[PDB]
Copies of this chain bind each other. A is one copy, B any other.
Amino acid sequence: SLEEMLTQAVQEADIEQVRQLLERGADANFQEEEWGWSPLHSAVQMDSEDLVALLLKHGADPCLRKRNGATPFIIAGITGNVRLLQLLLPNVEDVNECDVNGFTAFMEAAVYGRVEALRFLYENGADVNMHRKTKQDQERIRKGGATALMDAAEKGHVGVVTILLHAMKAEVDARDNMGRNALVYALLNPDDGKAKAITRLLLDHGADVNVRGEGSKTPLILAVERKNLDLVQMLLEQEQIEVNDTDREGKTALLLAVELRLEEIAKLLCHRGASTNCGDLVAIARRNYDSDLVKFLRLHNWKPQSSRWGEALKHLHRIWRPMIGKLKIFIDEEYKIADTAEGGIYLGLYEDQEVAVKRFSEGSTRGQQEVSCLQSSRANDNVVTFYGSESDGSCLHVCLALCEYTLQEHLANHRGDAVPNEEDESARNILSSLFKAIGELHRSGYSHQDLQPQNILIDSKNGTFLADFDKSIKWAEDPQKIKRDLEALGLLVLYVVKKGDISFETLKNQSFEEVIQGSPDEETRDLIHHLFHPEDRLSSLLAHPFFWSWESRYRTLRDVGNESDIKTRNQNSRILQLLQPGTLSTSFAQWTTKIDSFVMEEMNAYQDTLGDLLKFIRNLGEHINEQKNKKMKSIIGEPSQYFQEKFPDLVMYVYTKLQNTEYMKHFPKTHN
C-alpha cells in the first residue's frame, strides 16, 4: 500500500502527496495488474503537466507500455497537449512507435481530432501514410492497415482531413487490409454535413470511387442506404463510377433506392445509366405506393421439412415480407399455429429455417422469463430447440423449433396403433425424454412451473420436447417449488400411460391417493409414488423397472433364477436371505396353484417359495422353445407377458429386494 497510495494521489491530482510518496521512495513505474497503467500514463491521460514532470523528475519511464502496448507518448497523441509531447520527446527513440494494434501517437491525434498536436508530430518526423501493423490473428482476417486519414474520415474531423490531404502530403487512395479507403470510412460517419465535406475533399484529391467495404457495398450503395441525395450526386459526378455493380446479395444501388422509396435518388440513378433489369422495380414501387415512381419506371425451389406446416411455409417463403432482424414473419390466419395468453404462436422463417414463433409484448414479464430460460437451455436436447429472439418496436418474437403435434394431439392420433394389451414402448420413450428434459432444466437452476400436455411437443421424427417456459423460475430462490414439477410429472406419467383417455384436468382434480389407484400396474404406481414423495431424483428413476422392457424384466427374473443358490434351494444363502427371510399378501404366495394344472405337472417332472418361482421361470424360459413342449408354449403364450399378467407385483418386489445389493448386476443395463 505504497504505490497504491500513489495511484489515488495521482488520480485525485493531489500533487504534494505525490511528491511526499515519491520522496518516500515509492515506485514511479508501478503498473497496475489488470490493464498495465502507470502513474505517468494516468498523468498524461488526465492532462496534468505538474504531475507529468514531477514523475519524470523522480525517474519515470516514458517508454513504458500498458497492456495494449501503448506508451505515455502514444497517450499524449490522444489528449492532444503539445507541451506534453515536447516535454517527453527526448526519451522517445522512435516517434512512430505504436501499440499492439499499430496505433501511433499521430494516428491517435488524427482519430481524436487534435490539430495542434497533429501539426507538432508531423514536424517532428511522423509517418503520415503508416498502415496499422496488428496481431497475427487480426491480420489473417484482414483487419488493420488503417491510416490516419481513414480515422479522421470515420470520425468526421474535417480540419484534420484538409490538413492531411493538402499540407502533409497524405496518400488519399490508400487502403486498409480489407481493401477500404478513406471514402468508404467517410460515408460511415453519421453526421451528414461532416460526411459531405470529407467526401468532396477525398473525391477532389482522386480517391477511388469504385471500392468495397462490408457487404461488398460500394460508396454509391452506402450512400443510397444512408438515404442521402447529396452524397449520391457527388459520387455520380465521377463519370468513371460503376452504377450497375452489386453488393454481396446481388443488389444494385438502384434496386435499394426503389426498395427504400427513394424517388429522386432512383430517378437520378436511371438518368446516370443504371439498368431496369436489376429486379422487378415496378412491383416494388407499387408495393411502396410510389405513385410517381411507378409512372417514371413504366415510361422508362425451397423445401420445408414439416408435413403439417409444409404448404403454408412454402407460401411464407414465397411471399414478400420485411425482415424483423433475422425473422421473416406474417401475421395472418393462414400462418397461425395456436392462440396464447398473449400474441399467439405463428409460423416464421429464421436464418431461412422453419420456426414456430411465440409472440409477446416486448415489455411482458412472462415473455422475459421465457427467453431467459431458453437462453440457458440451448445444450438441453429435450427442450424444444431455441433459434433466438427479435424485437420490433412492440412485440417480442421468440423463435423455437417447429414440431408437428402437441402431446395431447399425438396420443389421440396414434390411439389406434396398439393392439389391446400390447407393450407400450413409446410411453417409455415419451416419458424418459421428459425426465431428462426436466432433469437438466433443474440442473440449470430453472424449474418449469406449468408442466401440462400442451407444453409438450412431438416433432416429425417422433422426438418429444419440453416447451414452455413463460411461467418458469430460478428455483434457487424457493427450493420448495421444485416439487411441483415432480408432482405434475406424476400426473403426466399416468396421462401418457392411459394413452390420453383420461384428461389432464381430471388428473389435476384427483388426490395423490386417487391417481396412484387409477394406475394400471405396480411399476407405474411405484414410479408415481416416488414422484409425489422425494435433484438426481429424476436420473435415479430412469433405472426404474417402469422403463425396463418386458424382455428385460423376463431376462432379469431368469438371470436370477440361474443363481446356483436358488437352484439347490440353499435357504441359508445370501441371495435367498434377501428374497424371503421367513414371515405374505403377495400374488406369488401359493403361486404353484395359480399356475395352470398341465404346465405345473410337466415342470415338476417346486414349493410356494419366491426362490422356487424364479427357479421355475428360468427353467421355463430355457426350454419352452424345444419341440417336445408344444402345448406348454401354446398355453403360456409369450412367457414375459404370461408371468407379469399372472403376478403383477413380482418384478417390483424383486427390484425392491435386490435394489442396492451386489445382485443389481442382473437388472437390465440402463441409462446413466
Point out residues on A near B: beta carbons under 8 Å.
12-13, 34, 45-47, 67, 78-79, 112, 135, 137-138, 140-143, 178, 213-214, 216, 286, 289, 291, 294-295, 298, 319, 331-332, 336, 339, 341-344, 351-353, 359-364, 375-376, 378-379, 381, 385, 387-388, 391, 393-395, 401, 459, 549, 551, 562-564, 567-568, 622, 625-627, 669
Contact = CB atoms under 8 A, between A and B. Distances in A.
28 contacts: A12-B298, A13-B298, A45-B286, A46-B291, A67-B332, A78-B289, A79-B291, A137-B359, A141-B343, A141-B364, A142-B363, A142-B394, A143-B395, A178-B361, A178-B363, A178-B394, A214-B363, A214-B393, A216-B363, A351-B375, A378-B385, A378-B387, A378-B401, A381-B381, A549-B669, A562-B625, A563-B625, A564-B625
Nearest to A362: B214
Contact of A626 (B375, B381, B564): B564
A140 B341 contact: yes
A15 to B, nearest CB: 14
Nearest to A563: B625
Contacts of A178: 361, 363, 394
A295 B214 CA distance: 39
In the complex this chain forms, how many copies of it are found? 2
Given A112-B289, A291-B46, A563-B625, A353 B339 contact: no
Given A46-B291, A79-B291, A361 B142 contact: yes
Contacts of A46: 286, 291, 294-295
Contacts of A78: 289
Given A137-B343, A567-B626, 19 more contacts: A45-B286, A46-B291, A67-B332, A137-B331, A137-B344, A138-B343, A140-B342, A141-B342, A141-B394, A143-B394, A178-B361, A178-B363, A214-B362, A214-B393, A214-B394, A351-B375, A379-B385, A564-B625, A564-B627
Contacts of A138: 331, 343
A314 to B, nearest CB: 13
B393 A378 contact: no
B363 A395 contact: no
Nearest to A188: B393
Contacts of A141: 342-343, 359-361, 364, 394-395
Contacts of A341: 140
Contacts of A319: 34
A552 B459 CA distance: 32
Contacts of A79: 289, 291
A41 to B, nearest CB: 11
Contacts of A567: 626
A378 B363 contact: no
A79 B396 CA distance: 32
A618 to B, nearest CB: 9
Nearest to A75: B289
Nearest to A12: B298
Contacts of A391: 214
A178 B361 CA distance: 9
A392 to B, nearest CB: 9
Contacts of A381: 381
A622 B625 contact: no
A345 to B, nearest CB: 10
A342 B142 CA distance: 9
A626 B378 CA distance: 52
Nearest to A461: B379
A311 B34 CA distance: 14
A298 to B, nearest CB: 7
Contacts of A143: 394-395
Contacts of A137: 331, 336, 339, 342-344, 359
Contacts of A34: 319
A214 B45 CA distance: 37
A261 to B, nearest CB: 11
Contacts of A135: 331
A313 B48 CA distance: 36
A1 to B, nearest CB: 21
Nearest to A341: B140
Contacts of A363: 142, 178, 214, 216
A495 to B, nearest CB: 25
A376 B353 contact: yes
Contacts of A13: 298
A294 B13 CA distance: 11
A331 B395 CA distance: 35
Given A391-B214, A393-B213, A45 B331 contact: no
Nearest to A388: B388
A265 B135 CA distance: 37
A352 B371 CA distance: 12
Nearest to A378: B385
A295 to B, nearest CB: 8
Contacts of A216: 363
Contacts of A401: 378-379
9 A-B pairs closest in CB distance: A141-B343, A564-B626, A137-B344, A141-B361, A381-B381, A47-B291, A351-B375, A143-B394, A142-B361
A401 B669 CA distance: 30
Contacts of A45: 286, 289, 291
Contact of A562 (B294, B344, B622, B627): B622
A152 to B, nearest CB: 16
Nearest to A629: B564
A548 to B, nearest CB: 12
Nearest to A137: B344
B331 A353 contact: no
Contacts of A387: 378
Residue in A34, A213, A298, A394 with the greatest tally of chain B CB atoms within 10 Å: A394
A518 B187 CA distance: 62
Contacts of A622: 562, 622
Residue in A141, A142, A401 with the greatest tally of chain B CB atoms within 10 Å: A141
A342 to B, nearest CB: 5
